[PDB]
Amino acid sequence: RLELPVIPLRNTVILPHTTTPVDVGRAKSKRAVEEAMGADRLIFLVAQRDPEVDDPAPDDLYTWGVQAVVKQAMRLPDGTLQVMVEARARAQVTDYIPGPYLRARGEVFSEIFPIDEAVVRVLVEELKEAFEKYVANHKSLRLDRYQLEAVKGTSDPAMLADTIAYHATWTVAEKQEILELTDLEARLKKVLGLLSRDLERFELDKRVAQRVKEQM
Amino acid sequence: DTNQREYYLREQMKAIQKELGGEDGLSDLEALRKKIEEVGMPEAVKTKALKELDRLERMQQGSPEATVARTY
Amino acid sequence: DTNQREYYLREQMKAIQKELGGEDGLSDLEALRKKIEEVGMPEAVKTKALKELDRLERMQQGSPEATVARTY
Amino acid sequence: TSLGRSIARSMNRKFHRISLGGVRDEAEIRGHRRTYIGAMPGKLIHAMKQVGVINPVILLDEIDKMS
Questions:
Q1: Residue A201 to residue B1, Cβ atoms within 8 A
Q2: Which residues of A touch B4 (CB under 8 A)?
Q3: Buried (b) or exposed (e) across C24-46, using 16+ Cβ within 10 A?
Q4: Of the residues A25, A93, A128, C68, which has the fewest C-beta atoms closer than 10 A?
Q5: Contact (CB, 8 A) for A56 and A31
Q6: CA dist., res. A182 & res. A187, Å (int)
Q7: How many CB atoms lie within 10 A of CB A101?
Q8: Residue C55: Cβ within 10 Å count
Q9: CA D49 vs CA A65, D26, D33, D44, D46: distances in Å
Q10: Cβ of D12 under 8 Å from any chain B Cβ?
Q11: Do residues A61 and A42 touch, judged by C-beta distance below 8 A?
């Protein structure tokens, strides 16, 4: 039944439905590497909680995290692992089994389906323009721009919200909220809010920076 | 948007101190005192207080008037 | 041009000596305070002075508050 | 004052004087705001500064003419 472990994150934020390399740089987490391949090559990543400690304890960890798949494994003799992943869906844990290693008994997945995408079509472009005009105008975030020809034709809120969260950067608390927010509509809402805040934040900086220009 | 801007307006003094002062906890005193908004603060008085909070730290260094307004 | 050129040259000459004076000033003073802080004297007063000292330390010109902080 | 300096030496403490004649504002007993350039510490502050010990014999001289 696809049993999963409880592997937390250290300093990196991993978004669901997004290909991102995973760095396992913990020496004491190597014991989870061999059992990750022993669970039908399924690895479960827990988002970065309260500052990371090297004490393995179920009470110090949480049941909310992202699920990752293993394609290939390439190793170095330095205690750090590079694995490329492609998240399928968020997986929750109901009953935690102490280890070591900490084993988790999975349950039915929290999946969603698109119904009546007519409103979703307008929401997609409304959310798109907010950061499309931001990155074009504001450049301190330094995100890529030559993927518009391929992302415009895709209509999938679950993937696109996590992709936009992966691209832009903001508070890690709401980042990991998006990682483990059941309400995908709330993910889109907060993403749109943050884009609007960043837009007005850059306009304030430009006018106040240009205000200082006029002052000098 | 107002509250988010509140936080970033304080982060403005944090930015102007990134190079000015080694630490910024002292100017973070009123930045944490921003809880005034949550404390009662009926809507109009809350807005007036936020206006008086965001824009009265004119000069982080020296500046008796700025410190005067800070103590105010 | 003369005011600008004088400003650049005169500022550097003074900022140089004032930089030395600042180190020989509060920077030497606080060291003496640290010498007597062996009793674990609260450094909260120092941190407040440091806020003033980080700002004036960066300002290697003018900064009269530095003198009052020095007496403080 | 002679009794004060005898008492301080009796318990090996510190004998000091504070002038309370022309004291009419808190800014003299207390200090002045540090944000300006003209500031001075209190008379009690000077008395505590002169001694190098936690507990001196602090005497408030002639409270009668306090204004």
A1: no
A2: 197
A3: ebbeebbeeeeeeeeeeeeeeee
A4: A25
A5: no
A6: 9
A7: 17
A8: 24
A9: 60, 19, 19, 8, 5
A10: no
A11: no
